[PDB]
Design a protein around this ligand. Structure first.
Ligand SMILES: Nc1ncnc2c1ncn2[C@@H]1O[C@H](COP(=O)(O)OP(=O)(O)OP(=O)(O)O)[C@@H](O)[C@H]1O
Ligand SMILES: Nc1ncnc2c1ncn2[C@@H]1O[C@H](COP(=O)(O)OP(=O)(O)O)[C@@H](O)[C@H]1O
Ligand SMILES: [Mg+2]
Lengths: 40, 378, 52, 51, 40, 209, 142
């Protein structure tokens, strides 16, 4: 799940068209992969 | 250790090259030099330094401690090979041969480094060894050996992304491109200033900011300056603490020409007293002056010479001899009239100027292959 | 407590009032807390667009 | 028709290739117009839900 | 080899062009401006 | 003599009378999967230099599955309609030729057409017809299919991240598959199609009504 | 050499010339399987387990005599356990990668089957390729 978050964190900077990965993308991702921890 | 290692060479500059300024450098450089076991790199710096004949016993206790770490390497290299973790002699001196890089000279470093390069099958230590060879190649300015391990370096980052090993590398190519007079490439390696880090070698991030603005102001034109450095918040908040540099940038962008020579004399003065810029401080401001002269002078056609002393910078005869040597230097595209007191400009095409460097490189390479052509075949 | 949807409302209300009282970075951090809070609710029927 | 299998015997594999060939041939990427299929069985118990 | 039958007896070039134009001109051009503040 | 490339009946999906005439608005209630496959396929096709520059290893091929009648064919109709790249669309139970070799050649020339042609898109349907679990080396009808899966499993590995060739694969049963097909480097994105419950369901009611 | 391709004339089938070798079926096998090759530099905080597995596997290659110094037999079986997603595959791949052993997992698949043999009525026919790559390690899943 560490790689599940940090691989995904590039999708946020990509979808807001950045070239530098920011720290709020990570905490934006932890609630999603950990939302899948909150899934079943 | 090689992380505080650049301040040593900066203070060897501060020792040697300013003639009057040679007291605090032999204070603090000795303060770091006869501690942390440094022995080898200051015997010729001791020749350039004072007598210091009392430091013989200081050399003896520290060649003794150097002998202690040497002999405990000699204590490690047999239990290290007795049970084989992963070539554990080179696992000891893959951390202590860099000590030996600091403590001893480059040789016992380099044979242990080209030695230990064959140990770690993953590049997570190899590329750090290569970083160490880059930094000692910078220290001894091994301008051929940096060309090797830059390519051997860059050949390792493509597997993985390793942007903490690629942007970190771009710091090194930036410092070499500003070490040489390659400024449009130096700012280009200094492009990001975002992924760049609170370094070991530029421990002030803001000194890195001053470096990238000093190279940017030559390296790029107005469109770039009028978008990149003027709208960057990450570049704005760090010169927000700079009183002069924020002024020195905005005196040029905001057409404040008279104070621009004052702050220009300040930054040029410190640049004259600066390591790594003292090779080219005269090269810097001779481009700054002709850059500002191009900026104001390529606006109007009939602006007179006496207009510029009060609004631009004082000295009518200074502007006289200063523009005269630049038109006479074959740049600064205008044509000054004298005994009616008016300065006239023109516009040239991109033909003969672009023709000029082509015949320069053509004659240069003709000299090259002519010379080699006589080298081979007797 | 066991509730999550009202945290979207109070953090979004802080995102109203810090920008309305001219505090940009705290509004960025509060809006980000609304993002990482809103990243755990099955139904944002109106709080989605209100966050948007 | 069949339901499916968990891959018992060597014969029914290409039979499932035949069946899925039929299914993709029904409504896969085609304006299936003017062609009407009429099917019949005794028991519909033993059929693919995809069919 | 390399005998020479004897009958008779970067780092530098861009710097050397800086010497070529500014060989001996305005070395300490620091205080002349402040000396032209009152004359100009 | 060497030849210009050539392949079988899947010539490029000729784009004039070949769109399945389906809009993105025709599919209601699939924001997660439509936006997600929008991220998965054509967003690396256009904005490739962000995947290169941030370097997040864009996916090679995609697998999509679920219960039937959940938009597996229809989503490929919509993406095939609004795409801009070349689109290659095979029916996956046609590699079982009677003659030997026509199968593996029929595998490799398609990927050669995706190579030579464009930064294109591969679609395969009913992968259950090929990728199974058990095998029997006593028929030849099974040995041929074994040689099919070896060829396509090779040709997926014959890439270099530089070509923008994407493979879309839609099936019904995930259980009757080999995970060797599902190893990373070949497949990394697996998309179930669950049932819309009420929320995405009423959108389908709005669109059909 | 046995199991080698050759060139052959067609009129009298006289042996013409020896061509390049066949690719190894174990190499094709691992090429099919595509395990995620790994190293120590991608291990997150498992160093005591690393010290255990070095004791189990790293010692009876580089020092086989060191067990004869103690008069005990060498270990042969390793059971790793813990929840999935905790480094089992990369660890077992990494150890063979650093000690240079043929990392050969088994899955019981049947695309692998044609390289082991025609039927391979046992698992034991794998041992021919195993001792043909004699410093080797066998890996298994659940
Ligand atoms: N937005 C929608 N969501 C789900 N189904 C829809 C939607 N719009 C139309 N449908 C209906 O779903 C049917 C199935 O579409 P499609 O063939 O893509 O399903 P499928 O998942 O491919 O199932 P199969 O693989 O069995 O064909 C269509 O015939 C259509 O009538
Ligand atoms: N300790 C770890 N350090 C780094 N990555 C890990 C670790 N444990 C698991 N992973 C991640 O888990 C994946 C491998 O799972 P692993 O535990 O090796 O096999 P399995 O899950 O089948 O036991 C890799 O992609 C890897 O990135
Ligand atoms: Mg379908």
């Amino acid at each position: 799940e560490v790689k599940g978050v940090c691989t995904e964190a590039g999708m946020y900077a990509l979808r807001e068209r950045r070239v530098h990965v920011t720290q709020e993308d990570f905490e934006m991702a932890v609630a999603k992969v950990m939302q899948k921890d909150s899934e079943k | 250790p090689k992380n505080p290692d650049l301040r040593i060479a900066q203070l060897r500059f501060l020792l040697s090259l300013p003639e009057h300024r040679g007291d605090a450098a032999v204070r603090d450089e000795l303060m770091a030099a006869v501690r942390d076991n440094n022995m080898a790199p200051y015997y010729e710096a001791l020749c350039k330094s004072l007598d210091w004949q009392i430091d013989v016993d200081l050399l003896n206790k520290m060649k003794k401690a150097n002998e202690d770490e040497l002999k405990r390497l000699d204590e490690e290299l047999e239990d290290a090979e007795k049970n084989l973790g992963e070539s554990e002699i080179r696992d000891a001196m893959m951390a202590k041969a860099e000590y030996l890089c600091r403590i001893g000279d480059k040789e016992g470093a380099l044979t242990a480094f080209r030695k230990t390069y064959d140990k770690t099958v993953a590049l997570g230590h190899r590329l750090d060894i290569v970083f160490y060879l880059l930094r000692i190649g910078l220290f001894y300015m091994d301008n051929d050996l940096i060309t090797r391990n830059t390519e051997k370096a860059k050949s390792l980052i493509e597997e993985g992304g390793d942007w903490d090993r690629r942007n970190r590398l771009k710091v090194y190519q930036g410092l070499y491109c500003v070490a040489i007079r390659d400024f449009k490439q130096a700012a280009e390696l200094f492009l990001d200033t975002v992924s760049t880090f609170t370094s070991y070698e530029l421990m002030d991030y803001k000194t890195f900011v001053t470096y990238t603005v000093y190279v940017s102001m030559i390296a790029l034109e107005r469109p770039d300056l009028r978008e990149k450095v003027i709208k960057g918040a990450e570049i704005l908040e760090v010169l927000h603490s700079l009183p002069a540099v924020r002024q020195y940038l905005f005196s040029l962008y905001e057409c404040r020409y008279s104070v621009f020579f004052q702050s220009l004399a300040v930054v040029e003065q410190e640049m004259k007293k600066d390591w790594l810029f003292a090779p080219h401080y005269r090269y810097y401001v001779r481009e700054m002056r002709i850059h500002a002269y191009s900026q104001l002078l390529e606006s109007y056609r009939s602006l007179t010479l006496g207009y510029m002393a009060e609004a631009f910078g004082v000295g009518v005869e200074f502007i006289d001899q200063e523009l005269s040597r630049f038109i006479a230097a074959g740049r600064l595209h205008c044509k000054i009239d004298k005994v009616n007191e008016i300065v006239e400009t023109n516009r040239p095409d991109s033909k003969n100027w672009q023709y000029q460097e082509t015949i320069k490189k053509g004659d240069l390479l003709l000299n090259r292959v002519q010379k080699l052509s006589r080298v081979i075949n007797m | 407590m066991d509730d999550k949807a009202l945290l979207v409302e109070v953090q979004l209300l802080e995102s109203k009032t810090y920008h309305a009282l001219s505090n940009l970075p705290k509004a960025r951090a509060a809006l980000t807390s609304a993002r990482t809070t809103a990243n755990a609710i099955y139904c944002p029927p109106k709080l989605q667009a209100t966050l948007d | 028709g069949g339901r499916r299998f968990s891959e018992g015997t060597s014969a029914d594999r290409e039979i499932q290739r035949t069946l899925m060939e039929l299914l993709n041939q029904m409504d896969g990427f085609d304006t299936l117009h003017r062609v009407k299929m009429i099917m019949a069985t005794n028991r519909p118990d033993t059929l693919d839900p995809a069919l | 080899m390399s005998e020479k039958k004897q009958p008779v007896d970067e780092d530098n070039w861009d710097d050397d062009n800086v010497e070529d134009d500014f060989s001996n001109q305005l070395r300490a051009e620091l205080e002349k401006h402040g000396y032209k503040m009152e004359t100009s | 003599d060497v030849l210009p490339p050539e392949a079988d009946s899947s010539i490029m999906m000729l784009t004039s009378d070949q769109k399945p005439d389906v809009m993105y608005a025709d599919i209601g209630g699939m924001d997660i999967q439509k936006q997600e496959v929008r991220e998965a396929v054509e967003l690396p096709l256009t904005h490739f230099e962000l995947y290169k520059q941030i370097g997040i290893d864009p996916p090679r091929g995609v697998l999509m599955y679920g219960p039937p009648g959940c938009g597996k064919t229809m989503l490929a109709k919509a993406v095939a309609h609004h795409t801009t790249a070349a689109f290659i669309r095979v029916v996956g139970s046609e590699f079982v030729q009677k003659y030997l070799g026509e199968g593996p050649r029929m595998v490799r020339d398609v990927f050669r057409l995706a190579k030579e042609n464009a930064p294109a898109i591969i679609f395969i349907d009913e992968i259950d017809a090929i990728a199974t679990k058990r095998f029997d080396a006593q028929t030849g009808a099974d040995r041929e299919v074994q040689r099919i899966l070896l060829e396509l499993l090779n040709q997926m590995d014959g890439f270099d991240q530089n070509v923008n060739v994407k493979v879309i694969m839609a099936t019904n049963r995930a259980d009757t598959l080999d995970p060797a097909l599902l190893r990373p480097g070949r497949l990394d994105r697996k998309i179930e199609f669950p049932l819309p419950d009420r929320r995405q369901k009423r959108l389908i009611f709005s669109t059909i009504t | 050499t046995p199991n080698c391709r050759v060139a052959l004339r067609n009129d009298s089938y006289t042996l013409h010339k020896i061509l390049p070798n066949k690719v190894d079926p174990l190499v094709s096998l691992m090429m099919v399987e595509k395990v995620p090759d790994s190293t120590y530099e991608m291990i997150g905080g498992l160093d005591k387990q690393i010290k255990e597995i070095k004791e189990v596997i790293e010692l009876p290659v580089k020092h086989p005599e060191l067990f004869e110094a103690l008069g005990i037999a060498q270990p042969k079986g390793v059971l790793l356990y813990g929840p999935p997603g905790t480094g089992k595959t990369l660890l077992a791949r990494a150890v063979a990668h650093h000690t240079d052993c043929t990392f050969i997992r088994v899955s019981g698949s049947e695309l692998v089957q044609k390289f082991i043999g025609e039927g391979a009525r046992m698992v034991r026919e794998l041992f021919v390729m195993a001792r043909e790559h004699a410093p080797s390690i066998i890996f298994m899943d659940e």
